[PDB]
Design a protein around this ligand. Sequence first.
Ligand code: OGA
Ligand code: MG
Ligand code: NI
Ligand code: ZN
Length: 331
Amino acid sequence: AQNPNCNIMIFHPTKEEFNDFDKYIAYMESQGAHRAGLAKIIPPKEWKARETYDNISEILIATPLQQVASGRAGVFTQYHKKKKAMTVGEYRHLANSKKYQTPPHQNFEDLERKYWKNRIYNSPIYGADISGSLFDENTKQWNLGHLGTIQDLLEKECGVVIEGVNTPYLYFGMWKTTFAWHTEDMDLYSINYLHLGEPKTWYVVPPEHGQRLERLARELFPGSSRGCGAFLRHKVALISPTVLKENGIPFNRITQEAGEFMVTFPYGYHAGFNHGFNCAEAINFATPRWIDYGKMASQCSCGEARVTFSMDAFVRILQPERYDLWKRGQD
Ligand SMILES: O=C(O)CNC(=O)C(=O)O
Ligand SMILES: [Mg+2]
Ligand code: NI
Ligand SMILES: [Zn+2]
């Protein structure tokens, strides 16, 4: 069995190996990459996502989110308070202000220490889930706006034609902006490209150990657990590496820098934070190996998780028994 300790693997494809996306994903899995839940892909040196980022300031963040924390430093929830619209140029200036900017630090480890010590005492503003792309249309390799769609994968594998579309999303971050512990909708893959700016630190639990994280989360967030049998789908709960180590949960960590891709694999729980002003692009995708994970994915039916139009069909075809109750949650 390849990668039996479930370490995060890092890949350096050549320009020739960068042509066929599906084939490279299947290669990475042949080497065991999926066992970690997360992999890093460093693009060939010849490749570029676009020529420059000099003209992005007029993108609108229509609903910036202020991430307000509650709890203790290592075990907290966050709620998202909606703020007034602002441009990317305005958001960048805000990120760089004395109130919100990255503090002085020695290296990524010192910054990680400061994040876990101090996150709860501040409320950084995140521009999340903005439909759009920063890949140039002429970029033919690993262009997250030109991937094969999940609806077409389900059709190729299972023969059933369904409605829905699959498009990318932009994330504009600042120091302390936080992504809570989650897997993807329907336990899909994700791919994330850091277009510009400061790094993003990731934490991940191997898929084969995801239920260990779920059981800890039910202990640590006991009212949320009683409210919903899949409450990590709400994307609000944080648990620090120190707490995970104290409770024996297997995990790994890695820092993504500008110019690098990360892939999350089906049922790989992940969480993390941004080091300073940055812009990432991400999208979900599927392969043949995902289909069995989709059939088994938990669902939020309490009504909190409220998700895309396209997830309807996935539930309807892969989880017909749940369909009824899950749709009660979504209406
Ligand atoms: O970058 C972020 O804020 C969160 N992204 C992801 O969870 C992802 O790509 O799967
Ligand atoms: Mg612009
Ligand atoms: Ni994710
Ligand atoms: Zn719920």
